Amino acid sequence: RELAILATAENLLEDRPLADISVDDLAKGAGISRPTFYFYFPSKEAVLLTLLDRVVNQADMALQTLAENDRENMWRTGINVFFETFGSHKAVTRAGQAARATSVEVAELWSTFMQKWIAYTAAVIDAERDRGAAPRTLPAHELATALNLMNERTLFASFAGEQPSVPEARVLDTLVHIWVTSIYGE
Amino acid sequence: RELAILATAENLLEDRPLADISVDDLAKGAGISRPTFYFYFPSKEAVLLTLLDRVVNQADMALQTLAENDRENMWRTGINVFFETFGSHKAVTRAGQAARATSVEVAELWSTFMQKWIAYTAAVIDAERDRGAAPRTLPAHELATALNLMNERTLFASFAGEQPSVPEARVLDTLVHIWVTSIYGE
Numbered sequence A, B: 001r002e003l004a005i006l007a008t009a010e011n012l013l014e015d016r017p018l019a020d021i022s023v024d025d026l027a028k029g030a031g032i033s034r035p036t037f038y039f040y041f042p043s044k045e046a047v048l049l050t051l052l053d054r055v056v057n058q059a060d061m062a063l064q065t066l067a068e069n070d071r072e073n074m075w076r077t078g079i080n081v082f083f084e085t086f087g088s089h090k091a092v093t094r095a096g097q098a099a100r101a102t103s104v105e106v107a108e109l110w111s112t113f114m115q116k117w118i119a120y121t122a123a124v125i126d127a128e129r130d131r132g133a134a135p136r137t138l139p140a141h142e143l144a145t146a147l148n149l150m151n152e153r154t155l156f157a158s159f160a161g162e163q164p165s166v167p168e169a170r171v172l173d174t175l176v177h178i179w180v181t182s183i184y185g186e
């Protein structure tokens, strides 16, 4: 019944914002009563937090899998984790980003994983400098932070079809170019 | 009295969110009554729209002034328009960005100027390619879009002291590096 509530919420978020979905809509989709819903989750906001947590953790585990197994392709496969994972869950990505403004739990989840992904990026940049493949230009952690924030804003604008945005079919190549030139460029 | 309402709103936004400022707070700061306020603006939301419009137009006119008068310094002076203009109006930047979620007028203002600034960036990249100084890599407009979105997310995270963020004293150098390497890099 937890999995049913989560699947119903992801389905309804494709059609409309969390504000326009009632606990009643989630209960009915999951084939349970309203008070039975409140047994699994305190709010529709908690449901969105759990959906975002699952997608964020899916991306994180995919990146850890890559890390355990040419330089342009190495960066492209890594950026592709985020493109495919968040791009396969557009409605949860869109709602989860909007909830950063109103939920400290969502803002803290997003902050915690962004810090992890920036640290991972900086560690790889440092390793590339240590092996003599990348030049010692900007502080690695500062470069990593701006490239991660670029991907966050650019991927999510593309997925939402914002004006302006890079078209979704061009966004992976666009980001890979800017990561490789900025990491290897003198 | 319009200028007084605008100055009062900018002062109070430094201390708290628009949600926690009343029309009554704005009237009292401007030395007018509540109904006199409603003569100049329909809402506290309209006041924020006007403040954002003034800051956005200040940045735009500064960039047009530059455009009318080495390549790394050329990009740095241009990015610096946004760093100094928005960085001199942090409270209006912060509130105006948050209002994109809830005001179609604010989202449309932001979209309209971002399209203009991306078009300007692409035109300069095109001119640099035409003169043989930059290589023909990504589509200029796509590269411009991602670099503009990077600056939007990275500058505003720095100004807000978000975790994560590039420190404000390092953000101009960070962005200039990624613009120059991505525009001139093979």
Ligand SMILES: CC(C)Cc1cn(-c2ccc(C(=O)NCCC(F)(F)F)cc2)nn1
Pocket: A066, A067, A074, A075, A077, A078, A079, A082, A086, A117, A118, A120, A121, A124, A147, A148, A149, A151, A152, A153, A155
């Ligand atoms: C496979 C490795 C050898 C290379 C590798 C790629 N990395 C990486 C880290 C973060 C992001 C990113 O896109 N971060 C924002 C995530 C957001 F916000 F878009 F969801 C993209 C790529 N890190 N290491």
Ligand SMILES: CC(C)Cc1cn(-c2ccc(C(=O)NCCC(F)(F)F)cc2)nn1
Pocket: B066, B067, B074, B075, B077, B078, B079, B082, B086, B117, B118, B120, B121, B124, B147, B148, B149, B151, B152, B153, B155
């Ligand atoms: C002086 C010229 C010869 C060079 C020049 C610089 N340009 C430029 C355009 C946009 C932005 C930017 O930062 N855009 C996001 C604005 C935001 F969102 F940060 F406020 C930064 C620099 N364009 N041309």
